Each structure stands twice: as C-alpha cells, then as structure tokens.
Nucleic acid binder design. Structure first.
Lengths: 205, 48, 99, 123, 125, 252, 182
RNA sequence: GUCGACGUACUUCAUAGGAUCAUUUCUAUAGGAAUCGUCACUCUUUGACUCUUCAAAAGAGCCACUGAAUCCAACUUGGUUGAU
RNA sequence: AUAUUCUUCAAGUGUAACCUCCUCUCAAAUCAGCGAUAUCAAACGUACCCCGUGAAACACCGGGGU
C-alpha cells in the first residue's frame, strides 16, 4: 500500500479487506486476488481541532487526518471510520461516497474540538488558557501539580498538565439494529435509528 | 508573531560578569650575561 | 590521490560530501574579458612567483631540519630518562635497606 | 513601582519618568511582590516558589524553601526577606548572605494578613 | 514560476524521472518523442497511461521523462510507471482533486503496477 | 493596549520634569547657542544676564519687546518652573510665549534674538512644550543656519513628520520638503490659525509673507490633477485670502 | 555591586547576591541551557525522580548481598531504566546511584534525540521544529517539546509526512516524488 | 599431573623547606598598603531593544473602512544647444 | 511563683534551620588549525613560425604568437 497502514477490518463475506492508511485514504482490497476494488478519499472530510498549545493552523496539521479505526457493517456495504480527529464517517462501499459525518463532541474543555480558536485569548505572551489557574484554587488538593513532564496518554488525568485530547479510539457496528458505538474521550457513544421519525417510503403508488 | 522555542530568561554562570569567580575576564628571554662564558664566568676577579 | 567510488560518494551524509569542482569548458565572458598586463609586468609577475617558490621551500626544508633533530634529541632525551629511572630504583632499595 | 498580575504580569516600572525596567510574563499564578534592597532586586511570590529577580528580568534564585507565599514583605535594615504563605510557617531569608535565618511555626493556620512594623521590625 | 511535479517510476534496476509541467502537449522520452520507443512491440505498453484515461488530459501538460538502467523491457515498465504517477500527481496538485480519484480508479482497474512498484522481494519457504 | 505603550505615554507628559541628575544633564544641555558640553555647566543666572542684556538691544530696535522684560524676562521669573504651576497659569505662559514668538520671528536674522529666545528656550522649555508656535514662527528660515539649530533640538510634533529626516542633519532641509509639509490638509489648518493670529497683531513681515504664498501656490500646483483634493482645499486657502484682504497692510 | 574596597571586603566576606549555597551552584540553570528546556520547574520535576532512583538504590543496598530478593530486584529495575534509556550500560549495578543524573534523563528528551539523530542542526532548532509541528512518532505527531522517548521508541521518530521540511530534504538528493506529495 | 620449599628475576613502600588564600576582625603572624555620604569627562567590558546575514520554518487565520511605501501605465517638467 | 507559666541540665537511627559529597563533564554537535579528490588564473618548461635590437651569426640578445 502507499503509506503506513493501521486498523484493518475484514468484510463478513470473507473476501474483502478494508484498510486505513496514513495518507487518509481508505482502500478496499480483495483477498483471493491481490488487487484492489477501489479506494475512498478521506483527507478532506475530516474535521481537525487546533489545540490550545498549537502553533499551526488547523488546516495544515497532520495530526488527525487519518483514521485509527474502521469497521464494516454486517451488511458489508458501509464503513464507519474514526481516528484521533473530531469526526466519525459513514462511507458507502459501492458508491464510494460518504453518507453523513458526525462530530463527536463540542467542548472547549477538551482540546481537539475547535477548528478556530478565539482571538481574544491570545495575549502577546501566550494563550489565556495555558496560564496555570491551579494556584488560585481554595483547597490544597487542587493546587498540587504532580504532573510529570512529558506524560502523554499516561496513568491519571492529573499527570497531563494539558486538557484531554479528542479522539475516537475504536469503532464497531452493532450486530442487531443499525447502531454503531464509537469509543470516545468523553465516553462510549452510541448512535442509533430507534426513533424512526422519518418518511422513507418504498414503491408508493 | 511570537518567536519559537522561547524560554524563561535566567542567569548565565559561565558567561556573566557580575559573578565573583568570573570577574577575572610580549615574550621575554633573559640574555645570558655579558660576563658569562659557557660556564667560566670570566668577570669574577678578587676581591670577591 | 584517493578517488572515492561514486556509489560511495552518492549516499554520504550531508556533513561529509566531498566537493569536487567540475572543469569548465564553455569559455566564460570574464575569461574573455580580463586584461593581462604584459611586457614589463610579466617580468615582475614571473619574479614574485619565482621568489615565493624559494621562500616556501627554504621554509619547508628548515622546518624539516627541526623534526630531523627532534627525532635525534628525544632519543638522547629518553636515554637520560632511563638512567634516572633505573638509578631511582636503586636508591629506594638503599633507602629501605636501612628501614 | 512594582506590579504583579494574578495571572502573569510582573512589571518593575520606573514610575515618574516613563522608562520600563523589566516585564516578565509568568505562566504560573503570582500573588504579591516587593522590591528587596533597591529598585534593582525584587522578589515575586509565584505559584509555589518565591523567586528572586533582577532589574532586567533575570532570575537570580529559585528559593527551594518558602514553599507557599501569599504575603511577602521585606524589611530594609536587616536585609531580611520575609514570607508567610498558606502553609502556616513564617520564614525570614537574609538575602545578603542567602542563609535562611529563622523558620517559625505559626501554629495558627494559613496566614491571612501580614504587614511589617517599621519602627520595630517585628511583624 | 513554472508549475511542475516530479514523480519516479521503477522496475528491475531502471529509474524514470518524469517531470510534468503545464504546457502545450508534448511528451518526450530522453529527448525524443514517445512514438519512438525502442522495443516496438511494447510501445503499447507505454501508451497505456495515455490511452486508459483518455488522450485529452495531456493537452495542457508536458511529460519530460528520462530513464537509465534496466534493459529493453524493464525500461518500458519504468516509463509506463512514471507517466501514470506523473499524471495522477499533477491533478492532485495543480488541477482538481476529483480528476485525481477518477484517474487513480482508472489505472487501478486496468493495472495497479502503473502506480505502485511491484517489488518482488524474495521469500524463503 | 500593551503595557509599554501606556507606560511611554507617561514619558511624554514628563518630558521636561528633571528627576535624576542625568535627566537634567540631557534636558538642560540642549540649547540654541552653546554646544552640549559648555551648556550643562552654567546657571540660569548666567543665561539671564546674557538674555536681559540682549533683550534691551531688541527693545531699542523696536519698543515692543519692552513689555516682556516686565513679565517673562524679569528677574523674578527665574524661580518659576512650568511643572509646579497650575493648568490655568501654564496657558498664560503659553499665551505670553505665543505672543513673544510673533515679535521674535521678524528679527530672526539678527544676533540678539538668538541670545534672547535661548533663555526662553532653556528656562521655559519651549523646545518641548510648545514647539508648534516655535516652528511656525520660524518656518520661513529653512535655508538659514539658525533653523538648522532649531531642528537639532526639537522632538518634532506629529504634524511636522515631513521634516523628521532632517533633524540633526548636515545639509539644510530642501525646498521641496517644505512643500511636502504644506501638501498635508492638516498642516495647512495650523498655518491658517497661525496667520489669522499673526494678522490680528499686525506684525506680518515681507519675507515671511512671501514664503507663505510661495508654499500656498505650490500646494495648488501639486494638487492640480486631483479635483477632489482641490474641492476640499479652498475652505483652507480662500478663508485666509478673505482675511488676508481685511488687513490694513498693503503688503498682505 | 560595587567591587567593594579592601576594607569593605573583610566585613562582607560572605555576602553575595548572585550565588547562594541554597541555590546550589545554579546547577539547575546550567543544565537547562545545555539541553534548552522550556519551563523552569521541569528540572526539579525530573530531579525528584532522579533522586527517587537513588533512594530506592540506597535501601536496596542495605539488604544483605546474598538475598534472592535484592539480586532479583535491581536487575529488574535496570531492565527498565535501560529500556527507557536514561543510563548507558546495563552491567554495573552502581550506575543506578552514580550515573543516574538529570542530564542523563534530560537527553532522552525529544529535541536532544532529534539532535542526536542529526535531524535538526542544533538543539534549539529542534525545539523550533517540534513546536511548529514537523516531527512525529509513528502515527501521531508530537507537539510537546519535552516528550520523553523510549530507547525502543527511539527508532520511530521521523519528519511528519508532506511537511515543508521533509520536502526540502528530498529536493537535496533530487529524489522527491509528488505521488507521495512529499 | 598440580601445589609447596629453596634459589633466581622484576615491581612497589619514606619525605622536606617556605609563602599566600582560607573564620562577616582574627588560620596565630605584629617586619603588612587599604576607615572619606561622588560632582564631571574619557576609554573598555557585558546585557537587553529594533532590523538582520549563513537559512530557513510557522503564522490566533477571516472580513470592512481609512493611511502610507514601492513598481509599471499615463501625464507634466528638464533633456542630443548633452538626460544616465 | 499558687495544675499551668518561667528557669536549669540531660537525652533522642529527632529534624523541611545549618555543614558536607552528588544531583555537570553527553554512545553529542559546532567554530579554528591542518588538508585530499578538484578548480580558475599567471609564470615557467617543449616544439613551431613571426618582430625589435644589431653590420651580422640555422644569432650563443630581448620580445610576441599558436
């Protein structure tokens, strides 16, 4: 394949393999042959956050424009992908076009949400979020910064000295009822269609 | 437009002049005497 | 001189890539322009190249003369170092023969 | 004049004329500061560690001691920087030698208010 | 300046350095047109990136290709690789993106060896 | 705004206030006649002797300077600093000095006005406080060596930003750069309010009143293309020439 | 202050405003410069760990030598402190008290490793490239300069793909390939 | 087969006489020079501050209004009785 | 002094005062010396014709040129 692949998944047919490379693009291979059926392009329709401590625009950072998971539906006709970005996708497999894009969360508290930070936070020396408000707090137990220096995704949430990142780690479809669960930073999401407040007719006269 | 790799300005010790230990910062060949021979020393005469 | 194979010369790290200037073939405009003073200046430009040849070789022979007598002097010097090595052993028996 | 932001300013302005000696942006919180012995050497009370700065904005010392400092004061005939933070203790730091003179257990809890006595140098 | 894109093409030990720039529609190989490639039976093996996608998409571009190494055949697999890569990496740069995924799906269904180097690294059993 | 922008705004308001000795040895050292080393070593008492001796010569040339020896050039007006006095009293010190630089500007080639204004420079700080009426009174002497000295002191106002490359320059400010001054629409509105102030005292002299028009002609000349620029220009120029015809003087 | 005179000297034999015994030679600044580390408290955030190595080294030295706990237990630890790469060799058991220094743990920092692997020219310039976002570890790019990197993970630092600084490198060898959009 | 005994051979072990700096006076010695509320000028060293080269990289992003500088187009003036 | 306050002395593998060694000296990189594969120019060397000097020497005098 072209770049580093990560997070494979196989169709329940047993005849196709869906890949998520680092260039963003998701490719669909055959197994009995080595050739590929097609690939679907995922670098554009991924929403990426600018973090608070960043120095680049959210448009041209290469943090989150790939997909660190993929899971075929049990129909074998749709892929749900999710990575360290803010967004989840639903690609159609034959027609090769995404269906709907889901923003996982809208929190200023988490880092990877905003495409564009506010400008009034930027004081001449630095963002007004990176300033430690920890010493202002009334209790002792809040003020004690025990964060290790470069601990990323570490043991406790205190040991970051950063806001938690937005990432959707692993995504699977449900077996039963058109649901799929994406495991987020905020916690495991569940999307569904159990409403059916929708007029989806078939063969009306 | 703030610069990258900024760091808190702090005191150089190997370079600063205000420190006590760092406050500090023509050949000469004496002619062998016009009296002297190789070792004889031809000038000394009594009285000594 | 040593001639590095080009397959070695190609995958070298950037710090050490050997600078080998290709010869120029198409005549430059500047090498068709510049004036060379001939006649009297040629007799006074041959001569400076004839003096600096002498003073480079008179140095590099006399500078070789020192490192010829450097080699002789340290052989004479180590012989005096060896006598002060062995005889210093003999005193520290004749000292500790008393003790 | 010396001022400190609760978030990050420390500005050691000359005040009558318009000159500006040092402007330090500290991303730790800061509570109070005084000039110690001249206009030249001042001492902020950071998030945890009272620092000792110079007229340019240089650090001169990261005081390992003085481990909380809400209220900070100097008294000028003894060269004796005094702190009393949210830890109860009361520490006097003889800033000419650098030798901490006396560390005093207050026994009464977090020091809510401190101000020197000029005539007497008791506090 | 001049919009260009450089792509490589590699078979057995033959490289293929295809500069692609916006131009008038000439396609050269080693300072010679592409209608004069040597093996004369495998000339349609290098007309594949011309004729698969359609010869209209070469009307505005130049394809300067120079090759070294290889043999008679294993250079023809290098110029068909670097023209396919040099065409499909100019539409993602200086022309439209939806052109590129039309091309990358066109060369794929025909022969994937046009794009990625089929590296026949050994296997021990 | 930032901190250092606001904290340099305090510096302009205390530009004259002598605080340290080094602040005094920079302010007092600049003057019209003496160089920078010999100026700092002399009292106001020394300067007042040379001024009041010179000012009595100007009173002989015309009697109008006799009044200023009662108020500004008097012996009691050595102790008064500007900075100590109230806001109403400073505007009267300006309105004396503004009335002074009208009478001073005419006799400006002469040596005694150079020794006369210098005490009014060095004691009354007119090279910092009111340098508009200092420069507008002496704007016609740009070729002379006395205006080259006047440039070598003054922190230039925001309206005279055309001359800002000629401060402490070798050669005098050239004739076209004087036009780039008058080409501005705001700098003319001074030179109206300077002239209508200057006509009311009926002391407008011949060489001055030429250099007004010889700039006011060229401003019409440089703007002869832009018909919008001329349309906004004649509330400035024709209101002068209306008031310039009301003069008793035939020369105006 | 003044270069005080000879009679001023003997009364002020001990005063100094810049250098204190509390301040401990300014060792913390002196190694903050050599490795260019951003925030000040980062040193003593390591030097609490690097001291905690020696306190576990000391009490494990106070056990008797033929104890199959003690023989197992520091060799269990030197496995980890070498995998993380703070110490050069695994053989000596007294590296664990003598060679465990902060400057040892402060050179498995990411910008030092980008200067060791000759990625950036200097060590300040590597902080300049991390903060701008050109470097990555495997999938995800890394943005804290002060990322500790395991000796095992030291294999995987590269320039982030399609960057303007990995594009310039490939132009020097005349080996770009814009199908990668390098 | 290895280890003693003896013989041989090499390696190694003790330094002393002064002077100064070391204690917030005083290193122990009277054989040693230093107690002053400063005002200027010169010269040198170091530090910021604004641009900036080897030499890049990244832009807290987008709009609206007003101001300026450069570069052509145009016009005017000077210019083969000599512009650069 | 009439259980606390104050005072004297003793003891503590008591010590966030105070002494001391470590918490620096890199599986690093630059700049300076040195200097190779190379390059441009000039001179000099070999052969070849030409010009001056000279009365003249296939000139043993100088010069130019390829």
């Amino acid at each position: 394949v072209y770049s580093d692949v990560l997070a494979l998944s196989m169709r329940p047919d047993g005849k196709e393999v869906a890949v998520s490379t680092l260039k963003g693009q998701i490719s669909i291979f055959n197994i009995e042959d080595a050739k590929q059926v097609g690939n679907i392009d995922c670098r554009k329709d991924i929403i990426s956050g600018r973090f608070n401590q960043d120095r680049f625009t959210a448009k041209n950072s290469e943090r989150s424009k790939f997909f660190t998971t993929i899971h075929y539906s049990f129909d074998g006709m749709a892929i749900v992908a999710g990575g360290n970005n803010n967004s989840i996708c639903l690609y159609d497999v034959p027609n090769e076009v995404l269906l709907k894009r889901f923003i996982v969360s809208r929190n200023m508290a988490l880092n990877g949400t905003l495409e564009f930070l506010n400008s009034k936070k930027m004081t001449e020396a630095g963002s007004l979020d990176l300033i430690d408000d920890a010493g202002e707090n009334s209790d002792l137990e809040d003020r004690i910064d025990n964060s290790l220096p470069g601990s990323q995704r570490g043991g406790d949430l205190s040991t970051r000295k950063m806001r938690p990142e937005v990432r959707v780690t692993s995504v699977q479809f449900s077996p039963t009822a058109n649901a799929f669960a994406a495991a987020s930073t905020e916690g495991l999401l569940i999307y569904s269609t159990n409403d059916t407040i929708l007029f989806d007719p078939f063969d009306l006269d | 437009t703030r610069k990258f790799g900024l760091v808190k300005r702090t005191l150089n010790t190997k370079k600063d002049q205000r420190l006590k230990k760092n406050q500090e910062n023509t050949r000469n060949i004496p002619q062998v005497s016009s009296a002297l021979f190789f070792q004889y020393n031809q000038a000394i005469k009594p009285p000594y | 001189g040593l001639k590095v194979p080009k397959a070695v010369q190609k995958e070298l790290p950037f710090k050490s890539q050997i600078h080998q200037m290709k010869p120029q073939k198409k005549k430059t405009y500047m090498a068709k322009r510049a004036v060379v003073l001939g006649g009297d200046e040629k007799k006074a430009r041959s001569f400076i190249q004839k003096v600096l040849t002498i003073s480079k070789a008179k140095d590099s022979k006399r500078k070789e003369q020192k490192a010829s007598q450097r080699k002789e002097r340290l052989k004479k010097l180590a012989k005096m170092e060896e006598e002060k090595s062995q005889r210093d052993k003999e005193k520290k028996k004749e000292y500790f023969a008393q003790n | 004049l010396l001022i400190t932001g609760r978030k990050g300013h420390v500005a050691s302005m000359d005040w009558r004329k318009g000159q500006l000696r040092a402007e330090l942006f500290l991303n730790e919180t800061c509570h109070s500061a005084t000039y110690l012995q001249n206009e030249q050497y001042f001492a902020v009370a950071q998030k945890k560690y009272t620092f000792i700065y110079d007229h340019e904005g240089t650090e001169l010392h990261r005081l390992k001691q003085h481990i909380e400092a809400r209220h900070l004061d100097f008294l000028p005939y003894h060269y004796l920087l005094v702190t009393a933070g949210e830890t109860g203790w009361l520490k006097y730091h003889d800033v000419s030698t650098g030798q901490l003179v006396s560390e005093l257990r207050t026994k009464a809890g977090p020091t809510m208010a401190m101000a020197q006595n000029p005539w007497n140098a008791v506090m | 300046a001049v919009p260009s894109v450089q792509t490589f093409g590699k078979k057995k030990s033959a490289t293929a350095v295809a500069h692609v720039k916006a131009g008038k529609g000439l396609i050269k190989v080693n300072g010679s047109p592409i209608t004069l490639v040597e093996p004369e039976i495998l000339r349609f093996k290098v007309y594949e990136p011309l004729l698969l996608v359609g010869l209209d998409k070469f009307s505005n571009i130049d394809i300067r290709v120079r090759v070294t190494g290889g043999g008679h055949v294993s250079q023809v697999y290098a110029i068909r690789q670097a023209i396919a890569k040099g065409l499909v990496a100019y539409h993602q740069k200086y022309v439209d993106e939806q052109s590129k995924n039309e091309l990358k799906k066109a060369f794929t269904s025909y022969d994937r060896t046009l794009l990625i180097a089929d590296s026949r690294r050994p296997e021990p059993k | 705004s930032s901190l250092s922008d606001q904290l340099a705004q305090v510096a302009s308001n205390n530009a004259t206030v002598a605080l340290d000795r080094k602040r005094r040895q920079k302010l007092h050292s600049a003057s019209l006649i003496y160089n920078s080393k010999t100026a700092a070593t002399q009292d106001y008492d020394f300067i007042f002797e040379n001024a009041s001796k010179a000012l009595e010569e100007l009173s002989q040339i015309e009697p109008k300077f006799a009044i200023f020896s009662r108020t500004l050039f008097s012996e009691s007006s050595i102790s008064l600093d500007r900075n100590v006095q109230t806001k109403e009293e400073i505007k009267d010190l300006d309105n004396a000095i503004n009335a002074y630089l009208l009478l001073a500007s005419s006799k400006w080639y002469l040596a005694p006005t150079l020794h006369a204004t210098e005490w009014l420079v060095r004691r009354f700080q007119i090279h910092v406080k009111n340098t508009e009426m200092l420069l507008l009174s002496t704007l016609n002497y740009y070729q002379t060596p006395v205006f080259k000295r006047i440039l070598s002191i003054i922190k230039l106002p925001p309206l005279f930003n055309c001359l800002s490359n000629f401060v402490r320059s070798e050669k005098p400010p050239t004739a076209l750069t004087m036009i780039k001054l008058f080409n501005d629409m705001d700098f003319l509105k001074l030179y109206t309010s300077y002239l209508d102030q200057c006509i009311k005292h009926n002391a407008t002299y011949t060489n001055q009143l030429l250099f007004t028009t010889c700039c006011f002609i060229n401003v019409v000349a440089f703007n002869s293309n832009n018909d919008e620029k001329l349309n906004q220009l004649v509330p400035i120029l024709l209101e002068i020439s209306a008031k310039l015809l009301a003069s008793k003087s035939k020369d105006c | 202050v003044r270069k005080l005179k000879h009679h001023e000297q003997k009364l002020l034999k001990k005063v100094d405003f810049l250098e204190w015994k509390q301040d401990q030679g300014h060792r913390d600044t002196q190694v903050m410069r050599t490795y260019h580390i951003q925030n000040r408290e980062d040193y003593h955030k390591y030097n609490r760990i690097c001291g905690d190595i020696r306190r576990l080294a000391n009490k494990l030295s106070l056990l008797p030598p033929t104890d199959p706990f003690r023989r197992k237990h520091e060799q269990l630890l030197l496995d980890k402190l070498y995998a993380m790469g703070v110490l050069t060799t695994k053989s000596k058991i007294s590296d664990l008290e003598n060679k465990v220094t902060v400057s040892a743990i402060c050179r498995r920092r990411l910008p030092v490793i980008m200067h060791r692997l000759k990625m950036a020219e200097t060590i300040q310039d590597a902080v300049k490239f991390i903060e701008q976002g050109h470097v990555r570890v495997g999938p995800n790019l890394i943005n804290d300069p002060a990322y500790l990197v395991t000796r095992n993970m030291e294999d995987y630092v590269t320039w982030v793909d399609n960057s303007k600084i990995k594009k310039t490198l490939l132009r020097y060898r005349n080996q770009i390939d814009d199908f990668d959009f390098s």
